[PDB]
Amino acid sequence: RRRVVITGMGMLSPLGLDVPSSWEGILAGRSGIAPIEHMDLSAYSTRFGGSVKGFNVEEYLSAKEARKLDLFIQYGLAASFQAVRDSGLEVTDANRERIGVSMGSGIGGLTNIENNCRSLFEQGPRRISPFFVPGSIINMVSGFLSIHLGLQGPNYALTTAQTTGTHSIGMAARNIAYGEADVMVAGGSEMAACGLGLGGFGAARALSTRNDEPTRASRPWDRDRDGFVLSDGSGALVLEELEHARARGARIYAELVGFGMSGDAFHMTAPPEDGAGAARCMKNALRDAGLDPRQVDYINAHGTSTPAGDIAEIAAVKSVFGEHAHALSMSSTKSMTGHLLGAAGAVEAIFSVLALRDQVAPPTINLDNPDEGCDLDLVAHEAKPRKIDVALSNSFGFGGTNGTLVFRRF
Amino acid sequence: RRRVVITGMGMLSPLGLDVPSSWEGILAGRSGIAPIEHMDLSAYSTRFGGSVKGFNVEEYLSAKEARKLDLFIQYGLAASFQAVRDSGLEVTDANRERIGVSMGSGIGGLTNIENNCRSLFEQGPRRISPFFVPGSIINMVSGFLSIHLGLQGPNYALTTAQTTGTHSIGMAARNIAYGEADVMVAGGSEMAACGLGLGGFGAARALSTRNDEPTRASRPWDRDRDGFVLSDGSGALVLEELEHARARGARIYAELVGFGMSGDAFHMTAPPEDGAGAARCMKNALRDAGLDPRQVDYINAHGTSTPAGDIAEIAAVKSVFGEHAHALSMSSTKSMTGHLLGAAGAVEAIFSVLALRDQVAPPTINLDNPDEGCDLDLVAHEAKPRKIDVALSNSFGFGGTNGTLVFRRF
Ligand SMILES: Cc1cc(C(=O)NC2CCCC2)[nH]n1
Ligand SMILES: [Mg+2]
């Protein structure tokens, strides 16, 4: 197996239109959550979320290119272009067969499907856009980026609900480690903030309804938590074989040493109370890295602010790490960004890499009164400078799909 | 790297509710294409396709469970349950962590999303189903199968448009070969036959409009071809590490020896005329298998019945195989099934495995007048018994995403 390093990162989040602006917000304990302005939610039980604010697609694409593509694809390309620029990588005829893309999404092109449905219901099929299918399907971030940059390596998309970004990054690393590629652009994007999204998650009673204090809604492990906050955005990493990186004098952020997957095999939406599945997933990731659990310094938790999910993740960490559970720091950056669904594992991979770069655990904000058994170092309220040699990032999704990435200082 | 064998197969196709009935139809040159009965298409330019006929979900799930799930999920679970039964595999605490699922879809729950949109616009957001998200998203075939059967191994879904089934099977094989799993259920499902699907493909003028003779619409490499026929269904294979298979006395259909991926990096929907991307993909797959191109006996082509796609595949085969292009047999089973989009590579992987079992090349029906340059053995009209030690299955998709599987007699 070849070693895999991170040489580039890109992001759209509710905290910023790039990685440094997003990370500035994370370290300041800043909320990206606000009343949603782009549609009328007067009649809805949840009227707030994490929007990407001031996104300027024409920095990336022509107006012609942009009008073809659902926002989730625009957000995915934005993060991908940032990551590739950030990497310094030059695509040539000599290497274009060795550079691939795995950018995914949990739900994909809801907004495009809504707009085309309006036309379909009032006028019939002859008013559907000719670009509807290619502009709405999840693999078109990978598609468009490969066409724009001339990437001829492995070209695919993961769709594992709220685990998508973690799985995308993990399986791209495997492509590089086993020699299918030298470089991969990997991560996820999501724009589910439309009637179907807020209505669909609303119908399932999954969302916080703290409309009077949106910035306090997302409160992972707090006793007053009442469901997750819906957010939009994208994260992309350039993953690179280490000798390829060293050969072109690339700036290396960190090393990707481990990837874990598991299924709960439990319930469509609910996690098992003891986090059995998450525990198997983290152990698979540590074994993959060849690490002792005692080597883990920081966990970026799934930590969605759901009653069942938050406690299951505490249980899984205590199971995997035993007494070391009291030495490591664990935080949920979802306290600040909310839940970017399929993009969550991408942006949280990036926050884990920067926790290594800056030797700082991001805070869990709004953790005013930790719930029964939530007695680990959850980095309540304020960022905590500490030694971090190994960082873990967990995602768990609908269908009991689990993913863990292990990152280490290089 | 461990060896990977096929021990089980399952299918819903326009030709049958299982593999044997589907394969019987394939070998008889029978069309599964008919005017669509489940909706009014009077306003649409294409009014026919490959429907699954007489599907009884209650053979698999309760009516209660089924009502929550989009047909693409029902179809994916049906094929998955069949494949696992066909394998003889017994899931226990001893092996459940070593059995995973990778069932994908090109477009996913379009019909469910359309119905929930109609409700949203016409009655309001309180008429969106509470089960809308988990009943519609692409990872929930892998999700629900893992819950029903107790599979705790790697749990994920690919979405690479019309390449999804090929990629799903190929990357599941990699999971087994590199020791992440001993068993994987892999394939794809699609039900895109709704307003948005037929309208979206209609808007792009991608579909055959031979409404007066639906069974003659799908005519790959024929000079009178006028676009692809939209079909619904599912394919699942049980992939298994060879020693695991031998240890439980499993019936082995064939060995999965090679997997290729590539990006065209050419166009969002059109293939390059010379099939450069398809040619790279097949060459990657053959080198992966460690084969001489002259060892290939049968190719199950993508062969969608599009003007550009059909000729590009001939060019790519001539590029990869030189003079051996005239010795091998190549057929499109899409002549009979139509285009199952994300499920196409799954059902066609199964047809390639049975071509090995039965030593027969399936026909390309409706190939009355081969087009200029389409001068290979395309098995026009009737099945051809011949020696087949190695069978290739090609898929190409939107975003220039290519996949090739290589199967060999065991
Ligand atoms: C911020 C930011 C990053 C970019 C960028 O990558 N520019 C595009 C020009 C054509 C493709 C990439 N723009 N704004
Ligand atoms: Mg036919």
Side-chain angles (χ1 to χ4, degrees), chain B residues 72-121:
Chain B
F72 94 90
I73 296 176
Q74 292 178 34
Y75 292 174
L77 291 169
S80 294
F81 286 132
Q82 284 182 28
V84 170
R85 192 184 219 213
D86 189 43
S87 68
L89 181 58
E90 275 142 51
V91 180
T92 65
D93 292 345
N95 65 14
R96 78 173 68 258
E97 296 189 18
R98 300 296 299 166
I99 310 157
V101 49
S102 186
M103 290 286 297
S105 178
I107 323 173
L110 195 50
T111 301
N112 215 15
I113 295 167
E114 192 181 299
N115 288 342
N116 275 268
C117 211
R118 189 173 285 284
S119 302
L120 167 58
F121 294 161

Short mmCIF file of all heavy atoms in Angstrom, two decimals, chain B residues 72-121:
data_model
loop_
_atom_site.label_atom_id
_atom_site.label_comp_id
_atom_site.label_asym_id
_atom_site.label_seq_id
_atom_site.Cartn_x
_atom_site.Cartn_y
_atom_site.Cartn_z
N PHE B 72 -37.65 1.90 -7.29
CA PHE B 72 -36.23 1.57 -7.58
C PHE B 72 -35.67 0.83 -6.36
O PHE B 72 -34.84 -0.07 -6.52
CB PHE B 72 -35.42 2.80 -8.02
CG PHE B 72 -34.70 3.50 -6.89
CD1 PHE B 72 -33.41 3.14 -6.54
CD2 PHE B 72 -35.32 4.51 -6.17
CE1 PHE B 72 -32.75 3.77 -5.48
CE2 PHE B 72 -34.66 5.14 -5.13
CZ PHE B 72 -33.38 4.77 -4.78
N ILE B 73 -36.09 1.21 -5.15
CA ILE B 73 -35.63 0.53 -3.90
C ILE B 73 -36.28 -0.86 -3.84
O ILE B 73 -35.58 -1.81 -3.50
CB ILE B 73 -35.91 1.35 -2.63
CG1 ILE B 73 -35.12 2.65 -2.66
CG2 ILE B 73 -35.58 0.49 -1.41
CD1 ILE B 73 -35.37 3.59 -1.50
N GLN B 74 -37.57 -0.95 -4.15
CA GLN B 74 -38.28 -2.25 -4.11
C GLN B 74 -37.56 -3.22 -5.07
O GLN B 74 -37.30 -4.37 -4.66
CB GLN B 74 -39.76 -2.10 -4.47
CG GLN B 74 -40.57 -1.33 -3.43
CD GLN B 74 -42.00 -1.16 -3.87
OE1 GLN B 74 -42.57 -2.04 -4.52
NE2 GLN B 74 -42.61 -0.05 -3.50
N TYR B 75 -37.25 -2.74 -6.27
CA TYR B 75 -36.63 -3.54 -7.36
C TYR B 75 -35.22 -3.97 -6.92
O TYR B 75 -34.83 -5.10 -7.17
CB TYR B 75 -36.54 -2.75 -8.67
CG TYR B 75 -37.84 -2.43 -9.38
CD1 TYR B 75 -37.83 -1.61 -10.50
CD2 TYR B 75 -39.05 -2.96 -8.97
CE1 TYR B 75 -39.00 -1.30 -11.17
CE2 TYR B 75 -40.23 -2.68 -9.65
CZ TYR B 75 -40.20 -1.84 -10.75
OH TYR B 75 -41.34 -1.53 -11.41
N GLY B 76 -34.47 -3.06 -6.28
CA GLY B 76 -33.11 -3.34 -5.79
C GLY B 76 -33.12 -4.41 -4.72
O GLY B 76 -32.29 -5.32 -4.79
N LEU B 77 -34.05 -4.32 -3.77
CA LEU B 77 -34.21 -5.33 -2.68
C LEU B 77 -34.63 -6.68 -3.28
O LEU B 77 -34.02 -7.71 -2.91
CB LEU B 77 -35.21 -4.80 -1.65
CG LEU B 77 -34.70 -3.61 -0.84
CD1 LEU B 77 -35.82 -2.99 -0.03
CD2 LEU B 77 -33.54 -4.00 0.06
N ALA B 78 -35.55 -6.68 -4.24
CA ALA B 78 -36.02 -7.93 -4.90
C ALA B 78 -34.83 -8.68 -5.49
O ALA B 78 -34.65 -9.86 -5.14
CB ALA B 78 -37.06 -7.60 -5.93
N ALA B 79 -34.02 -8.02 -6.32
CA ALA B 79 -32.83 -8.61 -6.97
C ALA B 79 -31.81 -9.07 -5.92
O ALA B 79 -31.19 -10.11 -6.12
CB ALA B 79 -32.21 -7.62 -7.95
N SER B 80 -31.60 -8.28 -4.87
CA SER B 80 -30.64 -8.56 -3.77
C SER B 80 -31.06 -9.81 -3.00
O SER B 80 -30.18 -10.67 -2.77
CB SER B 80 -30.50 -7.39 -2.85
OG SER B 80 -29.90 -6.31 -3.53
N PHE B 81 -32.33 -9.88 -2.57
CA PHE B 81 -32.88 -11.06 -1.86
C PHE B 81 -32.72 -12.31 -2.73
O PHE B 81 -32.27 -13.35 -2.21
CB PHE B 81 -34.34 -10.83 -1.44
CG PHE B 81 -34.52 -9.88 -0.28
CD1 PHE B 81 -35.45 -8.86 -0.35
CD2 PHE B 81 -33.78 -10.02 0.87
CE1 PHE B 81 -35.64 -7.99 0.72
CE2 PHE B 81 -33.95 -9.13 1.93
CZ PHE B 81 -34.87 -8.12 1.85
N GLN B 82 -33.07 -12.22 -4.02
CA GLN B 82 -32.93 -13.36 -4.97
C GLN B 82 -31.47 -13.84 -5.01
O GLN B 82 -31.25 -15.05 -4.90
CB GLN B 82 -33.30 -12.95 -6.39
CG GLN B 82 -34.78 -12.83 -6.63
CD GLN B 82 -35.09 -12.47 -8.06
OE1 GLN B 82 -34.34 -12.79 -8.98
NE2 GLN B 82 -36.22 -11.80 -8.26
N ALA B 83 -30.53 -12.91 -5.19
CA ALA B 83 -29.09 -13.21 -5.34
C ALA B 83 -28.59 -13.93 -4.08
O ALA B 83 -27.92 -14.97 -4.23
CB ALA B 83 -28.30 -11.95 -5.60
N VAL B 84 -28.92 -13.40 -2.91
CA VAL B 84 -28.48 -13.99 -1.61
C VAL B 84 -29.07 -15.40 -1.46
O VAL B 84 -28.31 -16.30 -1.11
CB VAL B 84 -28.81 -13.09 -0.42
CG1 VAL B 84 -28.57 -13.82 0.90
CG2 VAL B 84 -27.98 -11.81 -0.47
N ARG B 85 -30.36 -15.59 -1.74
CA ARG B 85 -31.00 -16.93 -1.75
C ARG B 85 -30.24 -17.84 -2.72
O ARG B 85 -29.87 -18.97 -2.34
CB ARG B 85 -32.47 -16.78 -2.16
CG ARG B 85 -33.34 -18.01 -1.96
CD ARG B 85 -34.74 -17.77 -2.48
NE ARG B 85 -35.76 -18.35 -1.62
CZ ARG B 85 -36.91 -18.87 -2.04
NH1 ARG B 85 -37.21 -18.89 -3.33
NH2 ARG B 85 -37.75 -19.37 -1.16
N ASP B 86 -30.03 -17.37 -3.95
CA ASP B 86 -29.34 -18.12 -5.03
C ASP B 86 -27.94 -18.54 -4.56
O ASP B 86 -27.47 -19.58 -5.01
CB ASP B 86 -29.27 -17.30 -6.32
CG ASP B 86 -28.78 -18.07 -7.53
OD1 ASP B 86 -29.21 -19.22 -7.71
OD2 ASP B 86 -27.93 -17.51 -8.29
N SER B 87 -27.29 -17.76 -3.68
CA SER B 87 -25.89 -18.01 -3.23
C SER B 87 -25.83 -19.19 -2.24
O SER B 87 -24.75 -19.84 -2.17
CB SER B 87 -25.26 -16.76 -2.66
OG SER B 87 -25.88 -16.40 -1.43
N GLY B 88 -26.91 -19.44 -1.50
CA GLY B 88 -26.95 -20.42 -0.40
C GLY B 88 -26.31 -19.86 0.87
O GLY B 88 -26.20 -20.61 1.86
N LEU B 89 -25.88 -18.59 0.85
CA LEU B 89 -25.14 -17.98 1.99
C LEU B 89 -26.07 -17.93 3.20
O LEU B 89 -27.22 -17.52 3.03
CB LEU B 89 -24.66 -16.58 1.61
CG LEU B 89 -23.87 -15.84 2.69
CD1 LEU B 89 -22.64 -16.63 3.09
CD2 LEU B 89 -23.49 -14.45 2.19
N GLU B 90 -25.57 -18.34 4.36
CA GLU B 90 -26.30 -18.22 5.65
C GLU B 90 -25.55 -17.18 6.48
O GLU B 90 -24.35 -17.37 6.73
CB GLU B 90 -26.45 -19.59 6.32
CG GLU B 90 -27.67 -20.36 5.82
CD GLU B 90 -27.53 -21.87 5.63
OE1 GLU B 90 -27.08 -22.54 6.58
OE2 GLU B 90 -27.88 -22.36 4.54
N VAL B 91 -26.25 -16.09 6.82
CA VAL B 91 -25.68 -14.95 7.58
C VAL B 91 -25.73 -15.31 9.07
O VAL B 91 -26.83 -15.59 9.55
CB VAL B 91 -26.46 -13.65 7.28
CG1 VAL B 91 -25.90 -12.47 8.06
CG2 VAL B 91 -26.49 -13.36 5.79
N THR B 92 -24.59 -15.28 9.75
CA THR B 92 -24.47 -15.60 11.20
C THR B 92 -23.67 -14.49 11.89
O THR B 92 -23.08 -13.65 11.19
CB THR B 92 -23.81 -16.96 11.40
OG1 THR B 92 -22.47 -16.84 10.91
CG2 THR B 92 -24.54 -18.09 10.71
N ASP B 93 -23.59 -14.54 13.22
CA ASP B 93 -22.71 -13.65 14.02
C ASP B 93 -21.25 -13.88 13.60
O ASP B 93 -20.46 -12.93 13.67
CB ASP B 93 -22.93 -13.87 15.51
CG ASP B 93 -24.30 -13.41 15.99
OD1 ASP B 93 -24.97 -12.66 15.25
OD2 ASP B 93 -24.67 -13.79 17.12
N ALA B 94 -20.92 -15.08 13.13
CA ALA B 94 -19.54 -15.45 12.71
C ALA B 94 -19.12 -14.69 11.44
O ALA B 94 -17.90 -14.54 11.25
CB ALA B 94 -19.45 -16.95 12.52
N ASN B 95 -20.05 -14.26 10.58
CA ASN B 95 -19.65 -13.70 9.26
C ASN B 95 -20.33 -12.36 8.97
O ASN B 95 -19.92 -11.74 7.96
CB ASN B 95 -19.88 -14.72 8.14
CG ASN B 95 -21.33 -15.08 7.92
OD1 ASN B 95 -22.24 -14.41 8.40
ND2 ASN B 95 -21.55 -16.13 7.14
N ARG B 96 -21.29 -11.89 9.77
CA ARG B 96 -22.14 -10.74 9.37
C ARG B 96 -21.26 -9.49 9.17
O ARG B 96 -21.60 -8.68 8.30
CB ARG B 96 -23.31 -10.55 10.34
CG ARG B 96 -22.96 -9.89 11.66
CD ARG B 96 -24.23 -9.61 12.43
NE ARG B 96 -24.89 -10.82 12.89
CZ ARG B 96 -25.96 -11.39 12.34
NH1 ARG B 96 -26.52 -10.91 11.24
NH2 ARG B 96 -26.47 -12.48 12.91
N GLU B 97 -20.13 -9.36 9.88
CA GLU B 97 -19.23 -8.19 9.78
C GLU B 97 -18.42 -8.24 8.47
O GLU B 97 -17.80 -7.22 8.13
CB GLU B 97 -18.27 -8.11 10.97
CG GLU B 97 -18.98 -7.90 12.28
CD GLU B 97 -18.06 -7.60 13.45
OE1 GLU B 97 -16.89 -7.23 13.21
OE2 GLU B 97 -18.52 -7.74 14.59
N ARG B 98 -18.43 -9.37 7.77
CA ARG B 98 -17.59 -9.60 6.57
C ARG B 98 -18.46 -9.60 5.31
O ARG B 98 -17.93 -9.86 4.24
CB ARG B 98 -16.84 -10.92 6.75
CG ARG B 98 -15.93 -10.96 7.97
CD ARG B 98 -14.80 -9.94 7.89
NE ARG B 98 -13.94 -10.21 6.74
CZ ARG B 98 -13.04 -9.37 6.24
NH1 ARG B 98 -12.84 -8.18 6.78
NH2 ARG B 98 -12.33 -9.73 5.19
N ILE B 99 -19.76 -9.30 5.44
CA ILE B 99 -20.72 -9.24 4.30
C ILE B 99 -21.24 -7.81 4.19
O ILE B 99 -21.89 -7.32 5.14
CB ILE B 99 -21.87 -10.25 4.47
CG1 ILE B 99 -21.37 -11.66 4.80
CG2 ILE B 99 -22.77 -10.23 3.24
CD1 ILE B 99 -22.42 -12.51 5.50
N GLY B 100 -20.98 -7.19 3.04
CA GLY B 100 -21.41 -5.83 2.71
C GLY B 100 -22.28 -5.76 1.48
O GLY B 100 -22.55 -6.80 0.81
N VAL B 101 -22.69 -4.54 1.15
CA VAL B 101 -23.63 -4.30 0.02
C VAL B 101 -23.22 -3.00 -0.67
O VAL B 101 -22.93 -1.98 0.01
CB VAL B 101 -25.09 -4.27 0.51
CG1 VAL B 101 -25.24 -3.39 1.72
CG2 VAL B 101 -26.07 -3.91 -0.60
N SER B 102 -23.20 -3.06 -1.99
CA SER B 102 -23.01 -1.88 -2.88
C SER B 102 -24.02 -1.98 -4.01
O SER B 102 -23.70 -2.53 -5.06
CB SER B 102 -21.60 -1.78 -3.37
OG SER B 102 -21.44 -0.56 -4.10
N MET B 103 -25.24 -1.52 -3.75
CA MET B 103 -26.31 -1.44 -4.75
C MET B 103 -26.55 0.04 -5.03
O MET B 103 -26.77 0.80 -4.06
CB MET B 103 -27.58 -2.13 -4.24
CG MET B 103 -27.44 -3.63 -4.17
SD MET B 103 -27.47 -4.39 -5.81
CE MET B 103 -29.13 -3.99 -6.38
N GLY B 104 -26.44 0.43 -6.29
CA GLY B 104 -26.55 1.84 -6.70
C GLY B 104 -27.70 2.08 -7.66
O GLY B 104 -28.44 1.11 -8.02
N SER B 105 -27.83 3.33 -8.08
CA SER B 105 -28.86 3.77 -9.04
C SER B 105 -28.36 5.03 -9.73
O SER B 105 -27.65 5.82 -9.07
CB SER B 105 -30.20 3.95 -8.35
OG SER B 105 -31.19 4.42 -9.27
N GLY B 106 -28.68 5.18 -11.02
CA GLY B 106 -28.35 6.36 -11.84
C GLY B 106 -29.11 7.59 -11.37
O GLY B 106 -28.47 8.64 -11.07
N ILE B 107 -30.44 7.50 -11.29
CA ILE B 107 -31.31 8.68 -10.99
C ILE B 107 -32.05 8.50 -9.66
O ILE B 107 -32.40 9.52 -9.04
CB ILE B 107 -32.27 8.98 -12.16
CG1 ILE B 107 -31.60 8.72 -13.51
CG2 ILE B 107 -32.78 10.41 -12.05
CD1 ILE B 107 -32.52 8.82 -14.70
N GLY B 108 -32.28 7.26 -9.23
CA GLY B 108 -32.85 6.96 -7.91
C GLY B 108 -34.33 7.23 -7.86
O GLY B 108 -35.02 6.85 -8.81
N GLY B 109 -34.81 7.88 -6.80
CA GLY B 109 -36.24 7.88 -6.43
C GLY B 109 -37.01 8.98 -7.13
O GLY B 109 -37.68 9.74 -6.42
N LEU B 110 -36.92 9.07 -8.46
CA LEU B 110 -37.44 10.23 -9.23
C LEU B 110 -38.97 10.26 -9.10
O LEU B 110 -39.49 11.36 -8.89
CB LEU B 110 -37.02 10.14 -10.69
CG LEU B 110 -37.18 11.42 -11.50
CD1 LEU B 110 -36.55 12.61 -10.78
CD2 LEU B 110 -36.58 11.26 -12.88
N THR B 111 -39.62 9.10 -9.19
CA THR B 111 -41.09 8.94 -9.11
C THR B 111 -41.57 9.41 -7.74
O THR B 111 -42.50 10.21 -7.70
CB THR B 111 -41.52 7.50 -9.42
OG1 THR B 111 -41.05 7.20 -10.74
CG2 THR B 111 -43.01 7.29 -9.34
N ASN B 112 -40.95 8.92 -6.66
CA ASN B 112 -41.27 9.36 -5.27
C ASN B 112 -41.09 10.87 -5.16
O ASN B 112 -41.98 11.53 -4.62
CB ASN B 112 -40.41 8.66 -4.21
CG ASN B 112 -41.16 8.39 -2.92
OD1 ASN B 112 -42.38 8.47 -2.87
ND2 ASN B 112 -40.42 8.09 -1.87
N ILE B 113 -39.97 11.41 -5.66
CA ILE B 113 -39.66 12.87 -5.55
C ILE B 113 -40.72 13.66 -6.34
O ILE B 113 -41.16 14.70 -5.84
CB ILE B 113 -38.23 13.18 -6.01
CG1 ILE B 113 -37.19 12.54 -5.07
CG2 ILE B 113 -38.05 14.69 -6.10
CD1 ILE B 113 -35.77 12.53 -5.61
N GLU B 114 -41.12 13.17 -7.51
CA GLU B 114 -42.16 13.79 -8.36
C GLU B 114 -43.49 13.82 -7.60
O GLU B 114 -44.13 14.88 -7.60
CB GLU B 114 -42.30 13.01 -9.67
CG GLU B 114 -43.12 13.73 -10.73
CD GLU B 114 -43.27 12.93 -12.01
OE1 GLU B 114 -42.23 12.62 -12.67
OE2 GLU B 114 -44.42 12.60 -12.36
N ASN B 115 -43.90 12.69 -7.03
CA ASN B 115 -45.18 12.56 -6.29
C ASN B 115 -45.16 13.49 -5.07
O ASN B 115 -46.18 14.12 -4.81
CB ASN B 115 -45.48 11.11 -5.91
CG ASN B 115 -45.86 10.29 -7.11
OD1 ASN B 115 -46.22 10.83 -8.16
ND2 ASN B 115 -45.78 8.98 -6.97
N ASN B 116 -44.03 13.61 -4.38
CA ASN B 116 -43.94 14.45 -3.16
C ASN B 116 -43.96 15.93 -3.57
O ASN B 116 -44.53 16.75 -2.83
CB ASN B 116 -42.76 14.03 -2.30
CG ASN B 116 -43.13 12.88 -1.38
OD1 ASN B 116 -43.55 13.10 -0.26
ND2 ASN B 116 -43.07 11.66 -1.87
N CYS B 117 -43.42 16.25 -4.75
CA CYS B 117 -43.43 17.62 -5.32
C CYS B 117 -44.86 18.03 -5.68
O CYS B 117 -45.27 19.16 -5.35
CB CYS B 117 -42.51 17.69 -6.53
SG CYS B 117 -41.78 19.33 -6.72
N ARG B 118 -45.60 17.16 -6.37
CA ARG B 118 -47.02 17.37 -6.73
C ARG B 118 -47.80 17.73 -5.46
O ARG B 118 -48.46 18.77 -5.45
CB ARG B 118 -47.59 16.13 -7.42
CG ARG B 118 -48.97 16.34 -8.03
CD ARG B 118 -49.45 15.16 -8.85
NE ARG B 118 -48.81 15.01 -10.15
CZ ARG B 118 -49.06 15.75 -11.23
NH1 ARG B 118 -49.93 16.75 -11.19
NH2 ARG B 118 -48.42 15.49 -12.36
N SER B 119 -47.68 16.90 -4.41
CA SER B 119 -48.29 17.11 -3.08
C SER B 119 -47.89 18.48 -2.52
O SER B 119 -48.78 19.19 -2.04
CB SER B 119 -47.93 16.01 -2.12
OG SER B 119 -48.34 14.76 -2.64
N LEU B 120 -46.60 18.81 -2.58
CA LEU B 120 -46.06 20.07 -1.99
C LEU B 120 -46.73 21.27 -2.68
O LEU B 120 -47.21 22.16 -1.96
CB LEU B 120 -44.53 20.10 -2.15
CG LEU B 120 -43.84 21.44 -1.88
CD1 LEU B 120 -44.12 21.94 -0.47
CD2 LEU B 120 -42.35 21.34 -2.14
N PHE B 121 -46.78 21.27 -4.01
CA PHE B 121 -47.21 22.44 -4.82
C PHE B 121 -48.74 22.58 -4.76
O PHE B 121 -49.23 23.71 -4.77
CB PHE B 121 -46.73 22.33 -6.27
CG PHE B 121 -45.24 22.38 -6.47
CD1 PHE B 121 -44.68 21.90 -7.65
CD2 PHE B 121 -44.39 22.95 -5.53
CE1 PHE B 121 -43.30 21.95 -7.86
CE2 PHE B 121 -43.01 23.00 -5.74
CZ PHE B 121 -42.48 22.50 -6.90
#
